[PDB]
Design a binder for this molecule. Structure first.
Ligand code: JHL
Length: 116
């Protein structure tokens, strides 16, 4: 039973977020919030109720909004889940999402090792 102290957590989690950002081009569609007006997809917020993206995860990590690892993981998962939900499996964005989820599953493992 491990309970992370706040700044040990930020230092534990930030490398996993940097690993997502470092995927180029795969992280590019995820670096800023989806703007349905600019992209001419007005149904986006009908399907994606709770948007999430790397810039929002970064800001939340930087402002102590993740008190335990599972809250951070939840938001990362949410940004993947939204992208798989909204996009077709053949699309670049969908395949890029899968690449990032693959990276995340490797990079989050040491933190998970510490918890269990
Ligand atoms: C850096 O400026 C950005 C790059 C990605 C651009 N983009 C693009 C542009 C549109 C024009 C065609 C194209 O190839 N884009 C693009 C550009 C860079 C990419 F890495 C990429 F995978 C796709 N499509 C986006 C889709 C999404 C998306 C997500 C995430 N979930 O549901 C949807 C819909 C998000 C961003 C998309 C928008 C401007």
């Amino acid at each position: 039973k491990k309970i992370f102290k706040p700044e040990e957590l930020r230092q534990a989690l930030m490398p996993t977020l940097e690993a997502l950002y470092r995927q180029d081009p795969e992280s590019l569609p995820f670096r800023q919030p989806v703007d349905p007006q600019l992209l001419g997809i007005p149904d986006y917020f009908d399907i994606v109720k709770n948007p999430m993206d790397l810039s929002t995860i970064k800001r939340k990590l930087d402002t102590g909004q993740y008190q335990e690892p599972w809250q951070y993981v939840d938001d990362v998962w949410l940004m993947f889940n939204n992208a798989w939900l909204y996009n077709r499996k053949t699309s670049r964005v969908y395949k890029f999402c899968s690449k990032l989820a693959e990276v995340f599953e490797q990079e989050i493992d040491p933190v998970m090792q510490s918890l269990g």
